[PDB]
Amino acid sequence: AYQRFEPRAYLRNNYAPPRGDLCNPNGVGPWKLRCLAQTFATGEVSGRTLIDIGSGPTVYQLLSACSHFEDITMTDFLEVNRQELGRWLQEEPGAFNWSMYSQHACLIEGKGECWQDKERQLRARVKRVLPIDVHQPQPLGAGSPAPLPADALVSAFCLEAVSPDLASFQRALDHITTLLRPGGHLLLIGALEESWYLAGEARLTVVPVSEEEVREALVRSGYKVRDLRTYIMPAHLQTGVDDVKGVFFAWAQKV
Amino acid sequence: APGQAAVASAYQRFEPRAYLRNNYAPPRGDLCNPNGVGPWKLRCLAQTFATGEVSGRTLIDIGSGPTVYQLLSACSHFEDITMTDFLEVNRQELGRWLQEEPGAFNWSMYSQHACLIEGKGECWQDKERQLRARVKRVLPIDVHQPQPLGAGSPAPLPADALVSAFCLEAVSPDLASFQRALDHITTLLRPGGHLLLIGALEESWYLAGEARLTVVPVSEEEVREALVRSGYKVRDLRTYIMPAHLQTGVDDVKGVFFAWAQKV
Numbered sequence: 001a002y003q004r005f006e007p008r009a010y011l012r013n014n015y016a017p018p019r020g021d022l023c024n025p026n027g028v029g030p031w032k033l034r035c036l037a038q039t040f041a042t043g044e045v046s047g048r049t050l051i052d053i054g055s056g057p058t059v060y061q062l063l064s065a066c067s068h069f070e071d072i073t074m075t076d077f078l079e080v081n082r083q084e085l086g087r088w089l090q091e092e093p094g095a096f097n098w099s100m101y102s103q104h105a106c107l108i109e110g111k112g113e114c115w116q117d118k119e120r121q122l123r124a125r126v127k128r129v130l131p132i133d134v135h136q137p138q139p140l141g142a143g144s145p146a147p148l149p150a151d152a153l154v155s156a157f158c159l160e161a162v163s164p165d166l167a168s169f170q171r172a173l174d175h176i177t178t179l180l181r182p183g184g185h186l187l188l189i190g191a192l193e194e195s196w197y198l199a200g201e202a203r204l205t206v207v208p209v210s211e212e213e214v215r216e217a218l219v220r221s222g223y224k225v226r227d228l229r230t231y232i233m234p235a236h237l238q239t240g241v242d243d244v245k246g247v248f249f250a251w252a253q254k255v
Numbered sequence: 256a257p258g259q260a261a262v263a264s265a266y267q268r269f270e271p272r273a274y275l276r277n278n279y280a281p282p283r284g285d286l287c288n289p290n291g292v293g294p295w296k297l298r299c300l301a302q303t304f305a306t307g308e309v310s311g312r313t314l315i316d317i318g319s320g321p322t323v324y325q326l327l328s329a330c331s332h333f334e335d336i337t338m339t340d341f342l343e344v345n346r347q348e349l350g351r352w353l354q355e356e357p358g359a360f361n362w363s364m365y366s367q368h369a370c371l372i373e374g375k376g377e378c379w380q381d382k383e384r385q386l387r388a389r390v391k392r393v394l395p396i397d398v399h400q401p402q403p404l405g406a407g408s409p410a411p412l413p414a415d416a417l418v419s420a421f422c423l424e425a426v427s428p429d430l431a432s433f434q435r436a437l438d439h440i441t442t443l444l445r446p447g448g449h450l451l452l453i454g455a456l457e458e459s460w461y462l463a464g465e466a467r468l469t470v471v472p473v474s475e476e477e478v479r480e481a482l483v484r485s486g487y488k489v490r491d492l493r494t495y496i497m498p499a500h501l502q503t504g505v506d507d508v509k510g511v512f513f514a515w516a517q518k519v
């Protein structure tokens with residue numbers, strides 16, 4: 001099913017206008033970047049190693065993260081996404097243009113940083129791009145190039161999007177939780193009350209979750225929820241590429 | 256007056272794109288190095304406008320050339336902007352940019368960096384859009400004339416504020432000429448009005464393609480005395496010393512000054 005997933009279609013649907021229009025601050029893109037930026041600016045999420053779970057073809061979710069972790073592992077289930085990443089990490093031709101997201105991240109963080117430096121830094125600190133399957137109790141396998149356990153995890157729009165129901169969502173969460181050291185941090189972004197989205201020829205089933213469900217799922221996996229918030233999807237961002245109602249952002253800490 | 260006939264003649268070889276490349280592309284156009292001159296200039300303008308002490312309806316940019324960066328912070332504070340230059344080829348380059356033509360020089364790195372410094376979370380596309388909207392006219396100017404815009408000028412006079420970057424010292428064969436050109440533009444500004452003046456220190460030449468232009472070297476002391484003689488109180492006068500890495504053979508500039516002055 002994910003076997004028909006078109007990276008460029010997905011990027012077009014979610015990271016080009018209107019949803020990728022970062023000029024309005026009331027949009028979902030600026031909201032997400034702000035969540036991430038505010039969270040790292042507290043100083044409490046730090047360490048040497050970080051893993052991004054189910055990164056798809058996207059990088060925005062590490063823009064703020066990358067100044068606090070010197071070893072970054074990105075991951076996805078699909079080769080075609082791994083290679084779309086690689087195209088961007090290696091500044092190859094036909095890479096997706098993330099420059100506006102980098103620019104807005106610089107603007108939000110407020111340190112005077114130029115966006116080319118931020119990209120440079122992200123590209124430098126991402127050492128590897130590995131396969132992953134969160135449906136496995138060892139999402140990475142055993143012969144894993146990745147430093148384990150990790151100091152922090154980031155995951156945006158993966159678990160709900162690869163899980164037919166709540167229970168599989170819970171298990172997938174337990175599975176990635178093993179990659180993270182005790183005391184470590186999980187940064188989790190996702191769709192609320194969504195049941196499908198499109199990516200070219202692919203129509204993906206999603207489990208609709210509520211904020212309450214996400215919270216309880218986090219507790220039951222062994223986390224303290226340091227923060228959990230919601231963005232309600234305005235009407236002009238309801239575009240026929242999915243049925244998302246809102247987006248959640250969770251900051252959680254392993255006990 | 257002979258001196259200014261030489262200036263006019265010399266400018267007839269002025270090539271915008273060469274001038275842009277020399278001064279507003281890398282390494283001088285490198286906005287990543289905060290210790291660079293581009294950021295220093297944007298910071299001077301941002302910090303001055305962020306006091307709120309400089310505001311009004313009308314602003315005039317004196318000797319804009321083919322450049323736009325010097326209005327990026329200002330345009331949030333003035334609803335009517337006049338841009339000006341001696342050369343048609345520069346005025347046309349402005350035209351291209353006003354029309355959002357591809358093939359126009361790209362000021363997006365400057366617009367972004369200005370957005371970054373001002374700290375209001377503005378995106379650069381909106382900044383540019385606002386600038387294009389607030390620029391109400393692009394006019395011939397000659398600062399050596401007692402009426403630099405001419406007699407029945409379109410321009411709303413007197414203006415609430417003037418900006419001038421790298422003009423007066425670049426078109427004046429000597430200090431006395433510099434002084435008079437200053438007095439001339441000062442007639443365009445209302446009393447109580449503000450002048451933001453950026454310029455080269457101790458430079459005697461720069462290159463604009465074919466053209467190698469003679470300019471009067473001035474010091475900070477000279478700039479300050481001239482402002483005083485023209486009837487200004489100096490609120491701020493800052494100096495940037497050009498690092499060796501930015502001394503590239505496009506001019507013999509030693510530093511840059513930023514002056515904020517208010518007309519008595």
Ligand SMILES: Nc1ncnc2c1ncn2[C@@H]1O[C@H](CSCCCNC(=O)[C@H]2Cc3ccccc3CN2)[C@@H](O)[C@H]1O
Pocket residue numbers: 002005014019028053054055056057076077078081132133134135156157158161162191194196197198241242244247
């Ligand atoms: N078994 C698996 N293990 C790990 N990862 C897997 C996997 N199967 C598929 N994946 C990957 O998960 C990524 C999911 S991309 C996320 C799509 C979520 N769908 C949406 O409709 C969101 C996306 C979105 C994004 C930004 C702002 C708003 C919205 C609205 N809702 C893809 O790259 C797969 O290869």
Ligand SMILES: Nc1ncnc2c1ncn2[C@@H]1O[C@H](CSCCCNC(=O)[C@H]2Cc3ccccc3CN2)[C@@H](O)[C@H]1O
Pocket residue numbers: 262266269278283292293317318319320321340341342345396397398399421422425426455458460461506508511
């Ligand atoms: N008679 C006249 N009245 C008014 N404007 C006139 C004029 N004759 C010529 N102009 C215009 O003056 C402008 C002068 S622009 C160039 C002068 C700059 N010299 C420099 O050396 C560098 C130096 C520098 C250094 C660091 C960062 C930026 C810069 C920018 N300029 C041109 O557009 C003329 O058409």
